[PDB]
């Protein structure tokens, strides 16, 4: 149902979900409250990030890379959020943080599908990899990402072509 008397068609493309905008300072387009990152890195991680010491090493590698970084997790909490926003405000890095979509078992279902088309790794709990052990190789690559109050969307990624039809092929068989 539309909020006005006119009927409109809205089309979105890519892997988009209903999270985003952890802090108001993650703004790159003050005209629209949209945080757009050019060639950004994404971080797939399935638990909360609150410890500063585990949070530091990932940006230590990403500041060397120089590309923007965007966080997907349950929550970037308190001190970990505090160092991220302050670092971004100083202008040394371009970063943003969003919540991961879904609730309950949807965490594993959605994060895996997010990571498959980005060319990176999910860094799930089963893999047994700590925050300090991450590097550029397992972080996926994307072209553009847009973050606002509710909508976070990705345009493309480094995911291999043959992987996404296989995920598509896996799903239609999973329909039954």
């Amino acid at each position: 149902e539309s909020k006005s008397a006119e009927t409109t068609l809205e089309t979105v493309q890519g892997m988009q979900f209903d999270r985003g905008y952890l802090s108001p300072y993650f703004v790159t387009n003050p005209d629209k409250m949209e945080a757009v990152l050019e060639d950004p890195f994404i971080l797939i991680y399935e638990k909360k990030i609150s410890n500063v010491k585990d949070l530091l090493p990932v940006l230590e590698n990403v500041v060397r890379a120089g590309k923007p970084l965007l966080i997907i997790a349950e929550d970037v909490e308190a001190e970990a959020l505090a160092t991220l926003v302050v670092n971004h405000i100083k202008g040394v890095i371009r970063a943003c943080a969003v919540k991961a979509p879904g609730f309950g078992q949807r965490r594993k279902d959605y994060l895996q599908d997010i990571a498959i088309l980005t060319g990176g790794t999910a860094i799930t709990e089963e893999l047994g990899i700590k925050l300090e052990s991450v590097t550029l190789d397992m972080l996926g690559r994307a072209d553009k990402v847009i973050v606002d109050k509710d909508n976070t969307t990705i345009v493309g990624g480094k995911g291999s072509k043959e992987a996404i039809q296989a995920r598509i092929e896996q799903i239609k068989r999973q329909i039954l």
């Binding site: 500063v52 940006l59 230590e60 500041v63 001190e79 040394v92």
Partner: protein, 94 residues
């Protein structure tokens, strides 16, 4: 100013203000921790022994000292903050 007794040592802390990594990452003061290093201000006579002998203190004047994070007691005099601690809590110098 203050005159230490026996093994008491006066330490002036670091006051490193903003903390940054060698790669340039800036850490806010909330995520910061109390410094474990300091500057020696004054030294007492030395550690007394059970036989009455007093051994000269190992630390000298003007040398930077790194100590235990929980060691030391804060003392305020003439508007300046000083950290006092005994030798056994002193870890290393320079």
């Amino acid at each position: 100013r203050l005159r230490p007794l026996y093994d008491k040592i006066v330490v002036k802390r670091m006051e490193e203000q903003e903390q940054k990594t060698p790669s340039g990452i800036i850490i806010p003061d909330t995520a910061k921790e109390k410094p474990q290093i300091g500057e020696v201000i004054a030294v007492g006579d030395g550690k007394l022994l059970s036989n009455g002998q007093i051994v000269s203190p190992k630390v000298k004047k003007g040398d930077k000292v790194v100590f235990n994070k929980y060691a030391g007691t804060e003392v305020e005099l003439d508007g300046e903050k000083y950290l006092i601690m005994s030798e056994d809590e002193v870890l290393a110098v320079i």
